[PDB]
Amino acid sequence: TGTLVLAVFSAVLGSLQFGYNIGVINAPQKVIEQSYNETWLGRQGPEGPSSIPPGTLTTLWALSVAIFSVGGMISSFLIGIISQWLGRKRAMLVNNVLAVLGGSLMGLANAAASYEMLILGRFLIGAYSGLTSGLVPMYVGEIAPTHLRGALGTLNQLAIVIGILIAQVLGLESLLGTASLWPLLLGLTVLPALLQLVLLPFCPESPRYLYIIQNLEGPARKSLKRLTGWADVSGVLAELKDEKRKLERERPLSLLQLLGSRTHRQPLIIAVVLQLSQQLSGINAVFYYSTSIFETAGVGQPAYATIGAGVVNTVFTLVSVLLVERAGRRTLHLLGLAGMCGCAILMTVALLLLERVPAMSYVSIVAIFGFVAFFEIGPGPIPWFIVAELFSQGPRPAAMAVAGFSNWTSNFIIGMGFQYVAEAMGPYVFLLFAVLLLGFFIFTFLRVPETRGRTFDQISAAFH
Ligand SMILES: C=C1[C@@H](C)[C@H]2[C@H](Cc3ccccc3)NC(=O)[C@]23OC(=O)/C=C\[C@H](O)CCC[C@@H](C)C/C=C/[C@H]3[C@@H]1O
Ligand SMILES: *[C@@H]1O[C@H](CO)[C@@H](O[C@@H]2O[C@H](CO)[C@@H](O)[C@H](O)[C@H]2NC(C)=O)[C@H](O)[C@H]1NC(C)=O
């Protein structure tokens, strides 16, 4: 099993970088912004009014995050062609080259006295994150033996949340996240990638790609032998043959082909809306700007509350992994949406009443965890389960891509928008989220079927 654990470790490193890049931006905000101010003057010089105008600074920061999201969008398109063209191991190695480039670009920003470098590096690391999110679950699913798929599936989510937590604690004022060393955080994401790059070459090649696509059996047999370790792997390749037959009897549809098939619409729309509900809920607000929200809410020390949100996210990630096994899909999503809406109407009230009762900050504090809590129960994992079980074997891949694209695009909006909205609306920002959640809830409650313990067969009938 040694090769198995090593390969799963490499995949987990990929997911860990992905999570770290998701969450590293939150803590150093009030330091990176001051650095931006510093460079923008260094540039202007004699005319400078002794301060970067707030509009430009807000725009640059919102760009610094929305560009991660844009790299994700661009990543959603390619996830397929390269996977079939180069494979999985080679794909992760090249994609790690991209990761190293992006991390170096982000790290060398301040020394270069320019912030365009940081934004470009964030674009590169967004492409990294999208590619690894696409390629890691696939690889672990290929290598995973017949009966450990369920155990390893939750690893791709445990790793992401743990990475968010690590980046969330590695940004304290005393820790790396200070004026002189902040680039180290944005540079730390170079180190694990290098490690992966120096570990993967020893790791095996996913048998399914090797046999199904490149139609070599001998190397597939060798990879299987070094993966599971049995003397003979006749049974697993015999099983591979039947799914080869199934794939050749159902050629996956093309993206424009899939969008052009009237039969697949009602499923498709469902998927897309779910992703919006997962994204336009407003969780990425809590993942990116939670330090600023807490500081606005009057919290005593926003950074500690930020790590608190991270740890609650992790705890209820594990709880959801325990739950989804024995609860359902539709019910979990409705519960999560309803919980997030009331929790955000609490937070709105807490902000609105902060002046009158100073202790309300604690309320706000707890509210956010509740928010995060509920997100990890219903809409965190579930939309992906619904999408996966909604579509047949053939048209699943293309559909996935579209969902991913939507999941990224919505993200961009929130990632790019929140700050402006935060300034325009006031305390009521989360109230907007509540309305959106309420909307989605109603739609879900009356439109999405129940996929757990159901045949694609019946589901199709349910849509009819
Ligand atoms: C808040 C977010 C972060 C925190 C995660 C969040 C938690 C999660 C992670 C992993 C699986 C299921 C749920 N729920 C997510 O959906 C999450 O992560 C992913 O989707 C990651 C990989 C997927 O297997 C393929 C899609 C990967 C991308 C196409 C979409 C990524 C979504 C992010 C999301 O931005
Ligand atoms: C941007 O940089 C300038 C200069 O470093 C900051 O100006 C200092 O700001 C503090 C607090 O506002 C004042 O007490 C100092 O007198 C200012 N020094 C100078 C030389 O002007 C400015 O505040 C910064 N603004 C932002 C938004 O970062």
Residue numbers in the entry: 21 to 484
Reported in the publication:
The major facilitator superfamily (MFS) glucose transporter GLUT4 mediates the rate-limiting glucose cellular uptake in adipocytes and muscle cells, and thus plays a vital role in insulin-responsive glucose metabolism. At basal state, GLUT4 is primarily distributed on the membranes of the trans-Golgi network (TGN), endosomes and 50–70 nm tubulo-vesicular structures known as the GLUT4 storage vesicles (GSVs). Among the SLC2A members, GLUT4 is most closely related to GLUT1, with a sequence identity and similarity of 65% and 79%, respectively.
We also successfully reconstituted the purified GLUT4 into nanodiscs of POPC plus cholesterol surrounded by the membrane scaffold protein MSP1D1. CCB is accommodated in the big cleft between the NTD and CTD. The major distinction occurs to ICH5, which is invisible in the structure of GLUT1, but clearly resolved in the EM map of GLUT4.
